[PDB]
Amino acid sequence: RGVQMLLTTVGAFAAFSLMTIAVGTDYWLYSRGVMTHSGLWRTCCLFKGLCKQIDHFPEDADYEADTAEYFLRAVRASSIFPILSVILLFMGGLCIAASEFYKTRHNIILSAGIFFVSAGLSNIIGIIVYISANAYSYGWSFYFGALSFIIAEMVGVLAVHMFIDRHKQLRATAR
Amino acid sequence: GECGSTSALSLSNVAGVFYILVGGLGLAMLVALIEFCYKSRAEAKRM
Amino acid sequence: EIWMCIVFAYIGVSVVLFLVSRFSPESTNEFGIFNSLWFSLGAFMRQGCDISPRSLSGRIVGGVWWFFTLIIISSYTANLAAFLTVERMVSPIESAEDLSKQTEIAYGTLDSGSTKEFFRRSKIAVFDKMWTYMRSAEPSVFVRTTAEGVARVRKSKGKYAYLLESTMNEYIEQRKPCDT
Amino acid sequence: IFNSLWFSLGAFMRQGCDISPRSLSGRIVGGVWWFFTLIIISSYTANLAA
Amino acid sequence: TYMRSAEPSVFVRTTAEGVARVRKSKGKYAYLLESTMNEYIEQRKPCDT
Fold first, then answer.
1. CB contact under 8 A, B28 and C60
2. A140-174 and A107-133 helices cross at what angle (nearest 10)?
3. Subunits close to E (at least 3 CB pairs below 8 A)
4. Cβ pair E12, E18 in contact under 8 A
5. A43 — phi, psi (to 5°)?
6. Measured between alpha carbons, how far is C107 from C127 in angstroms, rounded to an integer?
7. What residues contact residue C106 under an 8 Å CB cut-off, 6+ apart?
8. Contact call for residues B40 and C24 (beta carbons, < 8 A)
9. Do chains B and C touch (3 or more CB pairs under 8 A)?
10. DSSP secondary-structure letter at A1?
11. Are the beta carbons of B2 and E47 separated by less than 8 Å?
12. C16–B24: do the CB atoms touch at under 8 Å?
């Protein structure tokens, strides 16, 4: 019953905020050129201790045959997919709090679960894109970001479960 | 000569299937669900 | 790290199809999270099918999952065998001819001795070529004592070679750290 | 036609299915198809190494 | 006809001019030359030709 609301809220705030943390820093732990941190926007070394914007996808020493670094590197740049995923997460929780009142049993619950689960999916997609773009370890907040997508998916399972259960109350009360 | 005269380990060379087919997952899922909500929508429209 | 992504696709497909069976109720067999989860797992493995999803949406998505596990497992097995077939890394260089045909790993002897004068006076194109290399090599491949060549090669990380008499090479080869 | 197309699709895959031909005539087709795709994806595995 | 009409001029004064010119050309320029020098330089760092 209310446990669905519990897992719903804690999954929304938890996975959402954790995703934001993944956006913040700790994207790749490695030796720089020298060691530095990574957050997909800037790197900060251990001279030692300065920072600089490390999101320099274009580098003027390559071939650039046909939309390899253009399509690939440009797509990976600016973190297109994960931003979309997080925005759709805020849309998810928004449709949750909106779904609290204003019953409309089927529409808002189902739509919210769909956009939320698909949002986590797109988050994992952006993760894959960044991993491909990495072509010696990762950051803590990155791992918490992937796991944030995982827990988001679980919360989606509980969400659609609560939805179809509401449908069971619908056809049940129909009998 | 200064330019000279094996156990390869695939990491992401094959990952290209993911952001296309995996995208097709939510693709066919969404399109399907649209077909279902349209079918049930017309069912409610039959009243 | 690939494995994590693989499991991510696993649970992703599992949740999606679980929604497919759950949605639009009268119920199907994939209606359970152990049915979508377990059956997605057996869909990963080559284990025999148990519950065929009649849903055309679930049908095509499962098909996509056979595109996934078919290729990723195919590559796991094939490339895996391609790895075990290289069981031992043989010596890239074994003869003095190999030495003459490369420059990556340097090589030399003492700064004197019957060996140095030997290669100085040798007439073999291999030996003469190697002599020409070492006498002009930079830095100096010559050393004053045997231990100099020993520690030199040990710190060389395999990038410098030392030539000497067979017996001494045996004695050193039979002594710790046994790294020669 | 969904059973034929989708069972034929999973038939293309190494994975088996629940339904099985029993007409002892189309069953021949399923068998020779296993024999065909067998060497198809098998040889695909062979080249995959190379 | 192309090269004598190529703008800017594809002509240089020394071999190293063509060498570093192609090296910075990112492959967008070709240097036509004698086989021997091409081989010797090809046997030399940064081994990019």
1. yes
2. 160
3. A, B
4. yes
5. -115, 145
6. 12
7. C137, C141, C156, C159, C160, C161
8. yes
9. yes
10. -
11. yes
12. no
Q: Is B16 on the interface with C (CB under 8 A)?
A: no
- For chain C, which residues lie within 8 Å of any Cβ of chain B, measuring from their own Cβ? 1-2, 5, 9, 12-13, 16, 19-20, 23-24, 56-57, 60-61, 64, 67-68, 71-72, 75, 79, 82-83, 86, 101, 103-104
**Cα–chain center distance at A162:** 23
- Look at C12 and B8 and tell me if their CB atoms are within 8 Å: no
B36 touches A at CB < 8 Å: no
* C-alpha of C50 from chain center: 39
Q: State how far the Cα of C14 lies from the Cα of C19, in Å rounded to an integer.
A: 9
The residue behind tokens 């995959």 is: D48
A84 near B CB under 8 A: no
Experimental method reported for this structure: cryo-EM
Q: CB count, 10 Å around CB of A135?
A: 9
CATH assignment of the domain containing A89: 1.20.140.150
C106: part of which helix (H) or strand (E)?
A: strand C106-108
Please report how many Cα atoms fall inside a 13 Å half-sphere around the Cα of residue E13, on the Cβ side.
0
Give the SS3 label for residue A82.
Answer: helix
Task: For residue A154, give Cα distances in angstroms to A33, A92, C19, D45, E25.
Answer: 40, 14, 12, 36, 53
Q: Extract the tokens encoding E2.
A: 């192309």
Q: After which residues is chain B broken (C to N over 2.5 A)?
A: 5
Q: How many domains does chain A have?
A: 1
The answer to whether residue B3 neighbours chain E at the CB level (below 8 Å) is yes
Taking a C-beta distance cutoff of 8 angstroms, is the pair A94, A82 a contact?
no
Facing residues of A44 across strands?
A: A51
Which CA distances in Å does A127 have to A7, A78, A114? 24, 13, 20
CA distance B18 to chain C (A): 8
Domain region containing A88: 3-171
> Do the Cβ atoms of A12 and A155 come closer than 8 Å?
yes
C46 to chain D: closest CA residue: D15
Could you tell me the CA-to-CA distances from A101 to A107, A161, C5, C104 in Å, in that order? 13, 19, 38, 74
Bridge pairing between strands C106-108 and C160-162: parallel
> Which chain A residues are within 8 Å of E26, Cβ to Cβ?
60-63
